[model samples]
Target: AGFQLNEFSSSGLGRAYSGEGAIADDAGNVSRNAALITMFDRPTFSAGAVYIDPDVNISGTSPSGRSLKADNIAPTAWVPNMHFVAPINDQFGWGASITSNYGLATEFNDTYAGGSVGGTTDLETMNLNLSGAYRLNNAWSFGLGFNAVYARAKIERFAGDLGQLVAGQIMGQALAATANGIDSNTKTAHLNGNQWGFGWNAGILYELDKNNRYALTYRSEVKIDFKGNYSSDLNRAFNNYGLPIPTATGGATQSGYLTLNLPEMWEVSGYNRVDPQWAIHYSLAYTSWSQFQQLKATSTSGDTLFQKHEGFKDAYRIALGTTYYYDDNWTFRTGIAFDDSPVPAQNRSISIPDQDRFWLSAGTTYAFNKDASVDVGVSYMHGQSVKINEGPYQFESEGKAWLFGTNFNYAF
Candidate 1:
């Protein structure tokens, strides 16, 4: 068996429970803006009159290839997990495992887009696995695992509320015109998905002796075709209250159902017994982040729409970790990891600052008995800042992540 916990809070991350972007009418329905920098989904007060950024790139002026920033936003994420394994026979053991090994949480400030796409976003995902395996012999064994994944998303964006208030303060009036409206009504934003997908994982275990052993495994990347609904102010407003359907070519209101494909991952692990008094374990993992191709909303009639603002490329992450046991009840751990951002620098948004990342972590474990133990770990991450410039508009952002985790394991 196994379990995890997270309790770090960030002022610039996750969903904004109540702040400049929250609308009073948002009593329940649920909402989360963009976890990325392109938009925050945090809907603050707005000016009724329509206001545009004016810095639109008509063609070559667009930021196609450039550095981008994340408005110094900081995001947070936490997921708890549990797993169990049972013996199937004298030589083979089969069981099921479940965990939340994949997830994302990032958010920009109101100042992103120079104060555009106001709001916060909070997203979460969980995975369930049904596994079966057979021991080839005393020195070697192999097994495969399958998956069923679940996901949920929430966001809210502030509308253009200022309505050009007063004279003389043209800039201030435009700002007020965009931020002062109480009526016009706020837009809604949310994400939810419940779908089943196929996944396969296999591993080989080798034993050097009764006290020394190692396991090398390859967990193939599994793709999850997500089926769900996404809500947002832009989606609602563009749809004209879900009245006039927005065709991809219509250049107006785009809304409807959606399907997203989550990426696949690869993991390798090893365990060794240095001696009866010492032992160690290590793991390395890679993920095919490239599967995140496009975001499309489809209709019952086969009609589809794409957000002209989005584009993605392939990406990957490399993680190296180790654990050392000392005495009879204590273990020490350390690791280093790297992840490549999927978005090109030119298209990077402030709401979600995606960048190459480097991380360092350390932790320890305590044994309660021969069959029970606990583990605690902490990690710190740093990434390069990004800058995107196009026309007269510019977006800049940076981010740092800190993670603290605790887990409990039971053996029979």
Candidate 2:
């Protein structure tokens, strides 16, 4: 499992993305429930970006109690999105979105004691969707969309304390076990890959009245088989020491592949305009994270080059929010949510310190005129603290994040 994002638009982030499927506040909202596009009366366009400022720290010790620490491993990032929706007829509408669903980035000291398993990982992805909606009647609507997603990733690991143990056995000398002989910083593995994946999404909406609506949507899992190149210094060292080289024979660079399944999810959301100036919304979402059971990269020649066990379970999220129409040109909103983490504490790694989280958010919208508007939103997320240990290595992690976003929308 990796970092899943939902900051599609500034307006959605302000409300912790609650009621996203039914809000239909802007064309950008079509990503959650394409059926919402049928609610638009004219052509619409929206653009926005969310900036993530995260504070994540990992501190621990190697088998020998050597300090190992990496702060702000989750670097700051920006997630931008755009949308366009238009009515082809009174009952049919078309829309599209440019956004992302999963990503991860981390870096650690090369000489860190845990370098054997702790290195740098960078993964990025983008989703492109083409959706069409049909308004079947006054109270019902349905939508379907096709997706083509692009992903890029790179991973590296070091020898860390393990180098001394391996070196001692191969060199047949006590000196090899000393820090001066074979300490951390020895490159062990490195790999980089990129690929394009395909998936689909569908949604349904029910309108009880002009002021109340409910929506349900589902996004299919994306399958990506990354094909790229890899290099292994550990294997080279073994060969140099006259030891039987491993899976990935000692070489310059070799082509390889890794398969990853992005997991599917579903959501149920509702929006109710309680009064002229007051509206309430909520969302319940579930992700089939259990599908992601492991990470294994193989050489095109059929050898295991990298493997990590990731037995993630299903996860869920719940959110509630409300909006106040201060005037015809102003609107205010706030929200709260609890999103579960799929990673088991025992299985957590420095590269993915996922844990339960709580979110607090607020935002506002300003209408410059009847056809143009802008939104600004801010959110704070707190992650549950965790202590994890593998073999002799022990780790403690703490995380928190701030997200700021703004979006411009227009009806043409």
Q: Pick the candidate with the highest TM-score.
A: 2
Query: What lDDT score is found at residue 81 in candidate 1?
Result: 50
Q: What RMSD value applies to candidate 2?
A: 2.6
| Model 1: CA > 4 A from native | 1-75, 107-122, 155-196, 206-255, 274-284, 305-311, 389-392
Question: How would you encode candidate 2's per-residue C-alpha lDDT over 279-397 as one tens digit per residue?
Answer: 99999989889989887888877777778788898898899999988998999999999899888877887777788989899999999998899999999999788887754478888
What lDDT does the true structure give each of the candidates?
0.42, 0.84
Worst 10 residues of 1 by lDDT: 29-38
- TM-score for all predictions? 0.65, 0.94
lDDT of 1 by residue, 1-412 (tens): 0001111111101111111011111101001110001111222111011010111111111122222233333343345554445554665554444455444444434323222233444445565656555655566556666666665544433332211121113544443454333222334233345555555666555555555454444445545444455444443333534522223222223334565556554444444455654444444444455565555555445565323243656554454544556756876666666666777776665434466777566767677776555656566667776665432346555555566565555554
Distance from true position, residue 63, model 1, in Å?
Answer: 15
Q: How does candidate 1 score on lDDT? A: 0.42
